[PDB]
């Protein structure tokens, strides 16, 4: 019942399934088995992470599921509908983040000036 | 666990006969039951998987059926090569458990 955790870093998208802590887990994407020895090396899963590299929004986006070793894919209830547009060096920043950036830059500049002024005297 | 048992340890029948081998599960194993043939020399093979699905290379004279907790392998005209021990293995929940086996 613990939520699916999905982290996007550049092109790479890494999906982690923490509901099953003990055993090895296996992944299924769009009812096609994914992960393990296959032609595509962009997809690799180790421990509870499914690491997709060079994610293509049209191709690799859709239903995802994790199941432990010894549980059939069919009896799965928690599905991730990951539909994501991914670009290289893409990063989400909002207005307040940039405001914080400029304010903290101003503060460090003023602090350096004040430190120099006090150190001189 | 899901204890997997069989009706009889051994059954006797003449050649060319149609016989059935019953297998039972402690819980409903949802048709995930696997049939193996234990030849006397030691070599053992997978005859059918799932409910009734045949496995490649296994002759069509082998037929399975059943659902829920009671399963049956209804093999065809008894040839001499047919004489072996037959094992049913569940696949529903870990661990996979086999059964005692039938001698034919």
């Amino acid at each position, epitope marked *: 019942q613990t939520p699916y955790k999905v982290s996007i870093s550049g092109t790479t998208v890494i999906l982690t399934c923490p509901q099953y802590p003990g055993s090895e887990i296996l992944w*299924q994407h769009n009812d096609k088995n994914i992960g*393990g020895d296959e032609d595509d090396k962009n997809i690799g899963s180790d421990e509870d992470h499914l690491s997709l590299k060079e994610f293509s929004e049209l191709e690799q986006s859709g239903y995802y599921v994790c199941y432990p070793r010894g549980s*059939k894919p069919e009896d799965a209830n928690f599905y991730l509908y990951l539909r994501a547009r991914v670009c290289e060096n893409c990063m989400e920043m909002d207005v307040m983040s940039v405001a914080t950036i400029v304010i903290v830059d101003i503060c460090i500049t003023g602090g350096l000036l004040l430190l120099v002024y006090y150190w001189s005297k | 666990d899901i204890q997997m048992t069989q009706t009889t340890s051994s059954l006797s029948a003449s050649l060319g006969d149609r016989v059935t081998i019953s297998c039972r599960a402690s819980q409903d194993i949802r048709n995930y039951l696997n049939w193996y043939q234990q030849k006397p020399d030691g070599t053992v093979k997978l005859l059918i*998987y799932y409910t009734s699905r045949l496995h490649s290379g296994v002759p069509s004279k082998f037929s399975g059926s059943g659902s829920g907790t009671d399963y049956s392998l209804t093999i065809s005209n008894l040839e001499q090569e047919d004489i072996a021990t037959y094992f049913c293995q569940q696949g529903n929940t*870990l*661990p996979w458990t086999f059964a005692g086996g039938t001698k034919l």
Partner: nanobody
Amino acid sequence: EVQLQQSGPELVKPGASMKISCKASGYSFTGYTMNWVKQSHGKNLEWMGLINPYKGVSTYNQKFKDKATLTVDKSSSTAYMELLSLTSEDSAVYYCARSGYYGDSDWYFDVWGQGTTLTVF
């Protein structure tokens, strides 16, 4: 054709440790889960543990989690099992069974080995 070749009888002393080999040929070794199945008490078959050869992660049957450790040599396509502190109850025939990689076809063992008859005296 696909075939699993196992080792010899390997008579052992009680309290020792002996390693069983299952050398695979005719297919991609890493794409198929490898199990180990024990035939003791005359003909009773029991499942002991599975090792995912492409990964090295092993799921164990709780009865034998302290009596067997499973290792895989991907270079020689050979599966390995260590039975540690083998008493007289461990004297049996050990088979290595091949099943599918994923959760939809890993519960039936299509290809079996001939069997290694380990005896403890």
